[PDB]
């Protein structure tokens, strides 16, 4: 058979809300963190726990941001989120002027 569109999305949501592991790959995020850091100060060192905490904070922030942008999209009577939704969410939350 072939699952109708949107039905696997629901099971994916249930799967990723019941579990608690990390979603972003560890090495790419660590590399991104170092690439951003080297701008402010060269040859920095990072404790493993420091990067773990950074990843956890970033994932929590992004999950909250998506929860809000999903609320925005539903409010506009849409089901698909679009960049205007994220812009609205950040603007309301005070992260943009």
């Amino acid at each position: 058979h072939r699952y109708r569109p949107g039905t696997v999305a629901l099971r994916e949501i249930r799967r990723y809300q019941k579990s608690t592991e990390l979603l972003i790959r560890k090495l790419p995020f660590q590399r991104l963190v170092r690439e951003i850091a080297q701008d402010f100060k060269t040859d920095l060192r990072f404790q493993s726990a420091a990067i773990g905490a950074l990843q956890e904070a970033s994932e929590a922030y992004l999950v909250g941001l998506f929860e809000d942008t999903n609320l925005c999209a539903i409010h506009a009577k849409r089901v698909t989120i679009m960049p205007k939704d994220i812009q609205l969410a950040r603007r309301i939350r005070g992260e943009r002027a």
Binding site: G6, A9, L10, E12, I13, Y16, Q17, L23, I24, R25, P28, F29, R31, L32, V33, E35, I36, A37, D39, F40, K41, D43, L44, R45, F46, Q47, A49, A50, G52, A53, L54, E56, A57, S58, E59, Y61, L62, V63, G64, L65, F66, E67, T69, N70, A73, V79, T80, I81, M82, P83, I86, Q87, R90
Partner: protein
Amino acid sequence: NIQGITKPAIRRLARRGGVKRISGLIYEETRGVLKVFLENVIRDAVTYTEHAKRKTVTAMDVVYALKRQGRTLYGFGG
């Protein structure tokens, strides 16, 4: 390396948030947002390390940077 945040990873993050259907440009928008957030946190963490004259960014520095951002984090120190 911002392009290293893979499309399926952003999809998984959105799924955990309860999103059902995702537009094409949401990926670039999310990458920009994440870059801004990481820059904001990392600047304060690096400031704390420079203040202590260290060169190793300690987990406590990240925790303090997040706390000052009004985004307190539990599980790494206090």
